[PDB]
Write a protein that binds this ligand. Sequence first.
Ligand code: CHT
Length: 278
Amino acid sequence: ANDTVVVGSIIFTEGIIVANMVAEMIEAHTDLKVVRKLNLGGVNVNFEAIKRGGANNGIDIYVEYTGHGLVDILGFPATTDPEGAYETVKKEYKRKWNIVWLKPLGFNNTYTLTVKDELAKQYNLKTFSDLAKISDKLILGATMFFLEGPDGYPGLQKLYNFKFKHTKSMDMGIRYTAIDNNEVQVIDAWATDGLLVSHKLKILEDDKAFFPPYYAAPIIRQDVLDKHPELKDVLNKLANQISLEEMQKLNYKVDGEGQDPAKVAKEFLKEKGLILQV
Ligand SMILES: C[N+](C)(C)CCO
């Protein structure tokens, strides 16, 4: 029959790596072939694409983050434990959209606010509240996702009364260079970022708990599951298979060592026994 499915990703290192892992698992364990589609746009493009579907210029599968789905359902930022976010998005996406959340990959790739270790020492910074008290001295460099999202800087700034001198919208790798060069003093480091542990940076504590959990999980259209039921068990072979530290190392293989993400994804799966060498 030569059935195919479309796995989507937006264009950032982690997104492409885990989208490739999903594609590799499908091709290794089923007779399906995978179209890998890269979407330009923000944190909602894949959601609209999966509502369209791989037959109608959209996608069938992608890896979403629980807290993003949660804040989208609620219409305002909230905090909850990982189970609260996951169970809520799973039930709501099943009822409202016939989209099935599969099991979490294992890591929480949350937004953070991060500063240079030297700045944190010179002002004894530990928490977001500490940082807010001096924010009028500082420049924030942040991803477009962070500066535009309701779960991003808008709500955070309201809750903590952040008063940064200004914000600079920056590509993902650019913001690490910018904080290194002191063009900015704070960035929205993401917890799994490959460059993070390699730049002498301090992740500050979200002491008022503004951010939701951001656990990555594959999600799939129900009608694709209906046509190809094996996909459920196949994709759940990834359940809890990627820790925060493992994801960081894969991201660094791409962003720091220059390996291509397809190779990084496939080699990780082979080394962990999740696919076999052909
Ligand atoms: C994963 N983040 C929450 C850090 C943003 C991208 O969706």
